[PDB]
Amino acid sequence: SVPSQKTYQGSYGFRLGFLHSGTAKSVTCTYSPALNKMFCQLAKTCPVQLWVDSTPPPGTRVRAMAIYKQSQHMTEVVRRCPHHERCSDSDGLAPPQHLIRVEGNLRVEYLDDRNTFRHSVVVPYEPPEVGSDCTTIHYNYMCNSSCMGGMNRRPILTIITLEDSSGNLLGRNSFEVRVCACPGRDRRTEEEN
Amino acid sequence: VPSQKTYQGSYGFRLGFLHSGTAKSVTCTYSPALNKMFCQLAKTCPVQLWVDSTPPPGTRVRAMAIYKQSQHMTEVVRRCPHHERCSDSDGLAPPQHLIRVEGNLRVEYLDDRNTFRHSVVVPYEPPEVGSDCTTIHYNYMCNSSCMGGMNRRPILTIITLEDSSGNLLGRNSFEVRVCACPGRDRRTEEEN
Amino acid sequence: SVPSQKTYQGSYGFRLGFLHSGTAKSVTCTYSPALNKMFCQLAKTCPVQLWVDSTPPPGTRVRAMAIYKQSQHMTEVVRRCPHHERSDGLAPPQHLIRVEGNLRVEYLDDRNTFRHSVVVPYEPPEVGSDCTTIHYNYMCNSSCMGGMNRRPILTIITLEDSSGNLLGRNSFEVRVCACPGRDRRTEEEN
Amino acid sequence: SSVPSQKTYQGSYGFRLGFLHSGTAKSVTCTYSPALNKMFCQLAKTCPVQLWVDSTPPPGTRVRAMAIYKQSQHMTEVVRRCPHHERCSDSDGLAPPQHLIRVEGNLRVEYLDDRNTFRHSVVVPYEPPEVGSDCTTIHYNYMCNSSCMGGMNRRPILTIITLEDSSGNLLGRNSFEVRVCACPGRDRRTEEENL
Ligand SMILES: C#Cc1cccc(/N=C2/NC(=O)/C(=C/C(=O)O)S2)c1
Ligand SMILES: [Zn+2]
Ligand SMILES: [Zn+2]
Ligand SMILES: [Zn+2]
Ligand SMILES: [Zn+2]
């Protein structure tokens, strides 16, 4: 029973935003609005903005989970390849198997689901900082889309769910992700289609 | 399904609403064209009671929500799990109840023993010196959009006037949308 | 305290136009350019034309509001008499000015001034036509005891953006009477 | 200074801008004054800008548009939409709501909030002229009026069109003044009668 990817703004008007970073040679993470697709480098900072019409209560949580986009691969759990799992890159909080990490958050929590065996990373919701109208989470993707014995060129979605302290669903959104050496070049190439 | 049929009855019982318009700042606004209240979560929703003649002593006013659509009508309207557990409690209303009355310490809440439907009842008070109607302040404690609650399904509120024994004196109804921007949503919905 | 009646064509060159109806016995509404005054019958169609040099943006709105013309009555809210206050399903019973034939009409009791107004979306002229026509109804006679009671009123037509920011304003005096043709002719002979 | 350069540069490919000879008739939604080097256009309406080159730039060449204030005392201020227009819904799903300059009819359009200057710009791939045609046309939309309180607020702006290679190296730059107004025909005629 593949986890739901259906968009749901729900009670708090929950949407995702991304920086308008462009496709310049130097860019480590870039979002294509035309493709609803993030292009990012391995282990590099991937800002995802949370936008709400109304402030969820304290103890609201934000979960990230990867699934395969293709229907024939969707029941397979998205995990790191053997090679990246054994690279000495653990930050002491993230399980070595987990594709998606959060950086800069000491309250981050990781789940190996007892029944689905799917991986996810959860942080407390904090309201926007002074200056901002959105909340930024810094994701790291710890395997390349190309990795043999991992994703192996199969496209993935990230599903961002907003939940209350009791685990009740408040909101859900999703975006395609490609983890690659040259996000700028790969975004430009994929858009020319 | 409880009756929604309009009935002015013996005392000429009608509902009135503030003529608030659709300015960005408006927290609650009524569309006469749609017979539909647009209001924000937990915010004051004035409903006016108009009578041609003063109902008898011990007259009561009940509010009850039903789903508007025929395929959802037998389902009891309640809060979503999330809002049921949230600290938005006045100490009087059951946590499950969508419709509260604010500013009335004589308010009474019912879980109907047989229908399991929720309702909130207040004593009828005649208009204040100067005024021609009685205002009740309703709060809707879930958004129309709430996942695992109304979940975008439209609802009606039914306002019934009853005597002290619970005999029907009068009934009216209006559609409700609980939303972030009532002004914008009323304007948008009227454009159709 | 009192809403502004100062004419303002503003950015879009906003002016009012009226049908050149004359003063024949049969006429239900007639405008005097010499007096800038509409003479109309109770509840009858009052065409008001909106003329613009440039098309205002989508979500532009048109508000109508009545005030008393005389300085000693200007702070009093214009409303219907008790009798007429006692059919259309949309307009509050107290409101003097209604719009007919528009399902998108919106009515306001101002929270702070207690002044009444009616607002419709601006629609551009049809291709070929030069103006937009709104059909107003006045729901009380100028003569009504316990209402306007023979006091003259102005209608103020404001053009506003979707946020309620003023784009344009015009005004015209209104007399609601049994015989607009006769009353216009009589008032002009002065 | 901080301010991005507005200096004209035809550079290696002989890069210059052209505009339609549209005139000042009542109906005209965008009109260019050669005497003033100034585009007069209506909000959200199609603004053709022609790219002329002496020699075809390589594939992966890009064309960026950016607005700056013309006056030296306002030049370090970022040109953006007013609060009012930023919140208006008419959005194409691609352009940030804050961006004054959009490109229409181009699904390969890319928008930049510069991480360090905070300046906005819109980029499209350079395509050579079609069989028959002698120049490349881009369709710009300006999403705020020159008059807008809490935006440009009657301050004149320049649009800077830069030609860059795939690596972001500058190939060419040109500029033109822009007025976004209700009546471009009338406003061009009025502004030209001054001299
Ligand atoms: C033609 C045209 C066009 C396109 C986009 C924006 C615009 N100005 C606007 N001004 C407003 O206040 C409205 C707000 C809203 O988008 O509803 S849109 C005009
Ligand atoms: Zn790997
Ligand atoms: Zn809820
Ligand atoms: Zn009257
Ligand atoms: Zn603006």
Curated annotation (Swiss-Prot), chain B:
Effect of residue 109 to S: In sporadic cancers; somatic mutation
Organism of this sequence: Homo sapiens (Human)
Effect of residue 70 to A: In sporadic cancers; somatic mutation
Consequence of substituting residue 42 to P: In LFS; germline mutation and in sporadic cancers; somatic mutation
Listed result of changing residue 15 to R: In sporadic cancers; somatic mutation
Full-protein positions shown: 97 to 288 of 393
Protein's name in the database: Cellular tumor antigen p53
Outcome of mutating residue 111 to Y: In a sporadic cancer; somatic mutation
Outcome of substituting residue 57 to T: In sporadic cancers; somatic mutation
Effect of residue 72 to P: In sporadic cancers; somatic mutation
Record annotation: effect of changing residue 30 to D: In sporadic cancers; somatic mutation
Outcome when changing residue 187 to L: In sporadic cancers; somatic mutation
Annotated gene: TP53
Known outcome of mutating residue 174 to C: In sporadic cancers; somatic mutation
From Swiss-Prot, chain D:
Effect of residue 111 to S: In sporadic cancers; somatic mutation
Outcome when changing residue 148 to R: In sporadic cancers; somatic mutation
Listed result of changing residue 37 to D: In a sporadic cancer; somatic mutation
Result of changing residue 78 to I: In sporadic cancers; somatic mutation
Effect of residue 50 to R: In sporadic cancers; somatic mutation
Effect annotated for changing residue 102 to P: In LFS; germline mutation and in sporadic cancers; somatic mutation
Result for mutant: residue 11 to R: In sporadic cancers; somatic mutation
Gene name, Swiss-Prot/TrEMBL: TP53
UniProt-recorded name of the protein: Cellular tumor antigen p53
Annotated phenotype, changing residue 92 to H: In sporadic cancers; somatic mutation
Effect of substituting residue 191 to V: In sporadic cancers; somatic mutation
Recorded consequence of changing residue 173 to Q: In LFS; germline mutation and in sporadic cancers; somatic mutation
Portion of the parent chain present: 95 to 289 of 393
Annotated phenotype, changing residue 47 to G: In sporadic cancers; somatic mutation
Substitution effect: residue 167 to R: In sporadic cancers; somatic mutation
Phenotype upon changing residue 53 to F: In a sporadic cancer; somatic mutation
Listed result of changing residue 131 to D: In a sporadic cancer; somatic mutation
Native species: Homo sapiens (Human)
Listed result of changing residue 194 to T: In sporadic cancers; somatic mutation
Resulting phenotype, residue 82 to S: In sporadic cancers; somatic mutation
Annotated phenotype, changing residue 185 to E: In sporadic cancers; somatic mutation
